[PDB]
């Protein structure tokens, strides 16, 4: 009945959204660390190839390694630019909008949770409207519902309750008086009228919206109304709901091209054609025929297989033990870490300098 | 008097915190972009030095340039590692905790704002308790108070209302009945008792806390109490307030050593001693005497001035016009952008390869 406490069909879907919004910061940390980590992997590969080229100066393989190093360095550069120009704002914005909406929802749910007269009469009722519910563990009436911002550790967030279409559990409610409101539970937050609701000497002067505009509490003796938010459109009195849905839908993750390895032909890999054109052909434009001919000299072919073959050569190359530690691996493929590989490259670039004086 | 609407002395300090929390996501975007941008500046400098060394193979200056390139590459590597391992979590955590607390506060303030009976009687009163206040522009009773998550553009956040000590405006209130509560305004949210408050047929079964535990609304006919939060300690029923204060206090910004240039002597600059030891001395340990002697050969000295001198040499070096565009600058110091400089380095590394075959 109108102006009574809320049975679980009303608040459980809000609990479900609040718990899923709690994971948006986790996914933001996950994506920012993954972007940085993939950039580091691209740079390690560039550094390994660069070291291979510095050691093996002259050979066709060294020139192949120079093309390989350029490719991965560009990938590392472009991923860092994507992190600055796109991912940072995406992930800050999703963290902010989701956490803001979660605070809006949580404050409302926490108010319902506390506003009760007894074990059987209050604003937050169980499924059957027999008893008021209580929060214990991280659950309310059996429903996960911590009403708090849990510790942030990286994790991909679910899209069970907030996804591409909207808030899938926040559908139109055609009979709030029977499905949302109990028959007997007293709850002055269910109405703006003075007899049973928030009004004191008369009704509130207007309807009141709560949970960032999700629920509308009329100042008459009528049941609440809720927004249908399962089929959202870019737009409101419920703007924080739109903002969080839009921010989450916009996320790409650290999975765009800059962070992904290229496995097709060599001439099409990032940086290759340009480097071949200017460094080897001394031309500015080329047809792929001339590029592939040039690649055959250095890769013995032009497909991904010949690329992998050169990468395997790079991975097996040993470096001087004094450059890594008293016993550490010395093959490039067994070394990782940008700064470590950087200092190794510097040693060999210095040796290359010395050989040039002598020669 | 107890159980009356709240005059502005109560809610204005909450408005001030909410407006400042709104800037925490801005500062998170600011710091993440600044970290990436400074890393790019370190890498541009490394690439410029590397190009200088590839072109000028042989000379003492080229060896100085190799040491300079190693230094900036290490700075770029270490800043990216700091962004992955420290800054990402710091800025996600500050964004999440501040935005969550802001939603908790904003939902409560928005509830007070709407819960009124008339222009003179309601939960949110002006300074004198003459009229209820209204939100227009982004202000309530003259106080900036948007009650919304504003668009996120980079900006350093103020620490006026949330700082190292705590929430400086949220001090102990010794006379809430006269300073927070009006004398006449009706407000069922000011009390848990049934005559004038949230209770319907009897009092609420317990005191109720609102705004993430900031205000305590007793189920008796007494004035509210508020947390004193101006002198905070790492710990609560008001945990979201502690979380946001701790997350903001932990921020370092993109200003730690990895993102700052080093201006003292050369032997102490990142990477220098190690590179000199292994590449030039072929020793594992050295006294600074031997290092400085070696630096004199290549920098004509060992202070920051000789370092700047080599950097100026690098900045003036021209590259081939066909590597940058039909008319673009061709001196290294006038070029910027990691990927662009990367492709230039590759061209010259390829030329170095060719010279080694011939030699």
């Amino acid at each position, epitope marked *: 009945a109108a102006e009574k406490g809320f049975k679980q069909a009303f608040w459980q879907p809000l609990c479900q959204v609040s718990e899923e919004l709690d994971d948006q910061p986790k996914g933001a940390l996950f994506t920012l660390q993954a972007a940085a980590s993939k950039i580091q992997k691209m740079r390690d590969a560039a550094l390994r190839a660069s070291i291979y080229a510095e050691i093996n100066h002259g050979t066709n393989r060294a020139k192949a390694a120079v093309i390989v190093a350029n490719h991965y360095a560009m990938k590392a550069d472009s991923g860092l630019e994507a992190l600055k120009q796109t991912l940072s704002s995406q992930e800050v914005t999703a963290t902010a909008t989701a956490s803001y909406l979660k605070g809006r929802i949580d404050e409302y749910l926490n108010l319902l949770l506390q506003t009760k007269e007894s074990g059987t009469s209050g604003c937050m009722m169980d499924t059957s409207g027999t008893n008021t519910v209580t929060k214990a563990g991280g659950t309310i009436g059996g429903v996960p519902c911590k009403l708090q911002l849990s510790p942030i550790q990286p994790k991909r967030p679910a899209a069970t309750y907030l996804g591409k279409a909207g808030y899938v559990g926040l559908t139109r409610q055609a009979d709030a008086a029977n499905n949302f409101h109990d028959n007997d539970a007293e709850c002055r937050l269910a109405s703006g009228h003075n007899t049973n609701g928030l009004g004191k000497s008369g009704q509130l002067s207007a309807a009141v919206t709560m949970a960032a505009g999700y629920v509308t509490v009329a100042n008459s003796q009528t049941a609440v109304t809720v927004q249908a938010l399962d089929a959202l459109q870019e737009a409101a009195a419920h703007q924080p709901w739109i903002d969080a849905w839009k921010a989450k839908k916009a996320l790409t993750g650290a999975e765009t091209a800059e962070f992904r390895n290229e496995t097709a032909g060599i001439a099409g890999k990032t940086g290759v054609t340009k480097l071949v054109e200017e460094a080897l052909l001394k031309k500015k434009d080329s047809e792929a025929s001339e590029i592939q001919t040039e690649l055959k000299k250095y890769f013995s072919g032009h497909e991904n297989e010949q690329w992998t073959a050169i990468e395997k050569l790079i991975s097996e190359q040993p470096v*001087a*033990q004094n450059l890594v530690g008293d016993n550490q691996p010395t093959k490039l493929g067994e070394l990782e870490g940008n700064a470590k590989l950087t200092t190794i490259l510097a040693y060999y670039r210095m040796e290359t300098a010395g050989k040039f004086e002598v020669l | 008097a107890a159980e009356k609407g709240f005059k502005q002395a109560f809610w204005q300090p909450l408005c001030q915190v909410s407006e400042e929390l709104d800037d925490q996501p801005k500062g998170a975007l600011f710091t993440l972009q600044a970290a990436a941008s400074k890393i790019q500046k370190m890498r541009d400098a490394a690439l410029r030095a590397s190009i200088y060394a590839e072109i000028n193979h042989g000379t003492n200056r080229a060896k100085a340039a190799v040491i300079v390139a190693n230094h900036y590459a290490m700075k770029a590597d270490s800043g990216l590692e700091a962004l992955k391992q420290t800054l990402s979590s710091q800025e996600v955590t500050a964004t999440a905790t501040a935005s969550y607390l802001k939603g908790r506060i904003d939902e409560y303030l928005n509830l007070l704002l709407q819960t009124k009976e008339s222009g003179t009687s309601g939960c949110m009163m002006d300074t004198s308790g003459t009229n209820t206040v209204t939100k227009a522009g982004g202000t309530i009773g003259g106080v900036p108070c948007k009650l919304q998550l504003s668009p996120i553009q980079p900006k350093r956040p103020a620490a006026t209302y949330l700082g190292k000590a705590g929430y400086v405006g949220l001090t102990r209130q010794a006379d809430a009945a006269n300073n927070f509560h009006d004398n006449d305004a009706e407000c069922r949210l000011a009390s848990g008792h049934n005559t004038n408050g949230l209770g319907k047929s009897g009092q609420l079964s317990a005191a109720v806390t609102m705004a993430a535990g900031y205000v305590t609304v007793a189920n008796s006919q007494t004035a509210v109490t508020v947390q004193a939060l101006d002198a905070l300690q790492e710990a609560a029923a008001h945990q979201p307030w502690i979380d946001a204060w701790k997350a903001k206090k932990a921020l370092t910004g993109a200003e730690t050593a990895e993102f700052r240039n080093e201006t003292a002597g050369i032997a102490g600059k990142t990477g220098v001693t190690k590179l000199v030891e292994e590449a030039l*001395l072929k020793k594992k340990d050295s006294e600074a005497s031997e290092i400085q002697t070696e630096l004199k050969k290549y920098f004509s000295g060992h202070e920051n001035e000789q370092w700047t001198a080599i950097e100026k040499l690098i900045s003036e070096q021209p590259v081939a016009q066909n590597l940058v565009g039909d008319n673009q600058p061709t001196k290294l110091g006038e070029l910027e952008g990691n990927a662009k400089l990367t492709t230039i380095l590759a061209y010259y590394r390829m030329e170095t390869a060719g010279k080694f075959e011939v030699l």
Partner: nanobody
Amino acid sequence: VQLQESGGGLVQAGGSLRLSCAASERTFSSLGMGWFRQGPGKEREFAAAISWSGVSTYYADSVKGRFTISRDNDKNTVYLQMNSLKPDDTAVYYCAATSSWNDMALKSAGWYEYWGQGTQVTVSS
């Protein structure tokens, strides 16, 4: 680049042996070459080295005047002539190559990227 030594084995005290180390590629002529020896129970130690250009040679004090290192770029091979052997010369002898052209690299194992598998030399009294 792969190094294979040969010419080890048993020898009586006062006898002589010539160790050979052939590299698998003409790259050899850009490598400084060295010989290191690891006695039973002991740590591995420098014996002899020759600069990439063959212009300079270096010897541990325990083998100076007895051992001679030389190189033949045409055969991609470095040699260690070992005269007047004594039981204390018993060891696994490793050939090694360094990409450095700095002679200071030659005297410490840690500057050599390439290593042979080592050959046993056993001198009985």
